[PDB]
Design a binder for this molecule. Structure first.
Ligand SMILES: *[C@@H]1O[C@@H](C)[C@@H](O)[C@@H](O[C@@H]2O[C@H](CO)[C@@H](O)[C@H](O)[C@H]2O)[C@@H]1O
Ligand code: NAG
Ligand code: MAN
Ligand code: MAN
Ligand code: MAN
Ligand code: MAN
Ligand code: MAN
Ligand code: MAN
Ligand code: MAN
Ligand code: MAN
Lengths: 219, 103, 139
């Protein structure tokens, strides 16, 4: 007697497809609550839907290199200091494989970088002034009264040393890079020995608005 | 409090793809670090992988004379910090002097 | 132990000093290609000539290292593993004797160097290797 169909309850019809974390199962229901009878309509909408299954087990996480640390001090075996001398040294920087968990993969390539160096750490060197740097950023970029700057630096004159050192074992050679903060000796420019800094304000500076929230301004 | 869990993070557009469903903690969603979440439909999408910086946005409009323009980047990921010990979600800004023409 | 230089743990400065002692004529990075037990004959492939001596070995060539039955347990050498090795002119038979003046150090595989228990040793060996190849021994 024209009785329209009604959905019975959702019940699960497939197993969790994953061996860690969340996955998708399927639920299903029947148009039997009540059954359509005597030209009654079939139930509106879906007899199946997706449902989330939770293993509560963590998945493997592959390791990622963090960025290189600073170059270690430029030194040579059986020498107390090589700084201010035409004496190739050795230095290294390292990085960690961070994040690796639950039998995830190790990082690819080298955890150590090694190079050779001339130490000019705290070495007094004759200094020539740079011309003006390009204008820096406006700071603080959001905070009040943003200002910009450029500099003439007391730039050091590096000793005219070989770019390379001969090896002892190979027929080969190795690059030597100047390392260290030296003491550049300039005559005063604008009664300053190291750095001359100009500043000027930044003009018509916009407020820092969060993209996520922005263009939800009815006001 | 529950989140929308997605199976893909698209690094090009920063978009969440492959909806699994809602009514899950971010902890449960991110049990698999390849996944991503939204706190609210329309909200920002956060990958479940360890945090790192987005690429800097293009420089915004300049506001003819010399004004200034912003670009921004965000710390995107979960369960960690970016460079300066910055929590996930955090925007970082740069402001610059700019010139369009010469009125 | 008169089986090999038994080693306070070894430092980079320590290792550079001992490999430059008088008579130390070879330093090799080696891969143990195959053991044949009996005196035991350890078949070593040479990966790096860190220091070359009397014996002009090309890289990727093999040398037998002999060691008394008494010293097998203490050396504990496993096949396909890498080792830092150095010894004296005196310990040449061509083949090499492992004795009280022979350095044999397990060199961890490039993937297992990332393990916290290995990071310092692998950093030291990379630094040792580079110093030896480029600068050589002092005096
Ligand atoms: C079953 O056992 C688990 C411990 C993992 O080894 C599973 O692998 C992971 O499966 C998911 C999809 O379910 C991937 O997204 C992960 O990247 C994969 O490592 C394994 O299937
Ligand atoms: C060494 O310097 C030369 C300069 O000609 C350069 O081509 C090369 O990339 C450098 N190599 C390393 C390992 O720094
Ligand atoms: C079943 O589906 C929905 C309820 O979830 C309704 O459209 C109606 O009850 C139908 O029978
Ligand atoms: C299935 O979905 C919810 C329960 O998860 C309810 O609407 C009802 O139980 C339905 O059958
Ligand atoms: C270290 O080396 C360079 C920076 O000098 C980049 O390739 C990257 O920062 C890496 O971690
Ligand atoms: C080492 O080399 C220079 C400094 O001399 C920079 O690239 C950086 O400090 C690196 O660690
Ligand atoms: C900086 O000031 C003017 C304008 O750039 C230049 O003449 C010169 O480069 C100076 O160092
Ligand atoms: C800073 O000012 C403008 C650009 O903003 C240029 O004239 C020049 O690059 C200067 O350093
Ligand atoms: C650095 O450069 C400026 C210009 O050459 C000088 O004023 C200063 O004395 C030093 O030579
Ligand atoms: C923004 O800054 C520079 C590009 O201007 C790059 O270091 C990198 O793209 C960063 O996201």
């Amino acid at each position: 007697g024209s009785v329209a169909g009604g959905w019975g309850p959702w019940g699960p019809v497939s197993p969790c497809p994953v061996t860690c974390g969340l996955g998708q199962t399927m639920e299903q229901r029947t148009c039997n609550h009540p059954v359509p009878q005597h030209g009654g309509p079939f139930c509106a909408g879906d007899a199946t839907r997706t449902h989330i299954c939770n293993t509560a087990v963590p998945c493997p996480v592959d390791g990622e290199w963090d960025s290189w640390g600073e170059w270690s001090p430029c030194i040579r075996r059986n020498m107390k200091s090589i700084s201010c001398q035409e004496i190739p040294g050795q230095q290294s920087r390292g990085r960690t494989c961070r994040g690796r968990k639950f039998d995830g993969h190790r990082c690819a390539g080298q955890q150590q970088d090694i190079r050779h160096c001339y130490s000019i750490q705290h070495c007094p060197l004759k200094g020539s002034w740079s011309e003006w740097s390009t204008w820096g950023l406006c700071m603080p970029p959001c905070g009040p009264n943003p200002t910009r700057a450029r500099q003439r630096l007391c730039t050091p004159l590096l000793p005219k040393y070989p770019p390379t050192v001969s090896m002892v074992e190979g027929q080969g050679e190795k690059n030597v890079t100047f390392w260290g903060r030296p003491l550049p000796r300039c005559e005063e420019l604008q009664g300053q020995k190291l750095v001359v800094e100009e500043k000027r304000p930044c003009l018509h500076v916009p407020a820092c608005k969060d993209p996520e929230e922005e263009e939800l301004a009815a006001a | 409090d529950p989140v929308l869990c997605f199976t893909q993070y698209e690094e090009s557009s920063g978009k969440c793809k492959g909806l699994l469903g809602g009514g899950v903690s971010v902890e449960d969603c991110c049990l698999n670090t390849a996944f991503a979440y939204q706190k609210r439909s329309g909200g920002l999408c956060q990958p479940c992988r360890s945090p790192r910086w987005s690429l800097w946005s293009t420089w915004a409009p300049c506001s003819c004379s010399e004004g200034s323009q912003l670009r921004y980047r965000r710390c995107v990921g979960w369960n960690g910090q970016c460079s300066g010990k910055v929590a996930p979600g955090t925007l970082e800004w740069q402001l610059q002097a700019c010139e369009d023409q010469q009125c | 132990s008169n089986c090999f230089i038994q080693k306070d743990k070894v430092t980079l400065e320590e290792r550079l000093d001992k490999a430059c002692e008088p008579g130390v004529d070879y330093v090799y990075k080696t891969r143990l290609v195959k053991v044949q037990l009996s005196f035991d004959e350890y078949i070593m492939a040479i990966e790096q000539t860190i220091k070359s001596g009397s014996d002009e070995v090309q890289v990727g060539q093999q040398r037998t290292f002999i060691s008394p039955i008494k010293c097998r347990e203490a050396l504990k050498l496993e096949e396909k593993k890498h080792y830092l090795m150095w010894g004296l002119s005196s310990d040449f038979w061509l083949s090499y004797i492992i004795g009280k003046d022979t350095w044999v150090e397990h060199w961890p595989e490039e993937d297992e160097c990332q393990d916290e228990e290995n990071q310092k040793q692998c950093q030291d060996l990379g630094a040792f290797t580079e110093s030896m190849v480029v600068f050589g021994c002092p005096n």
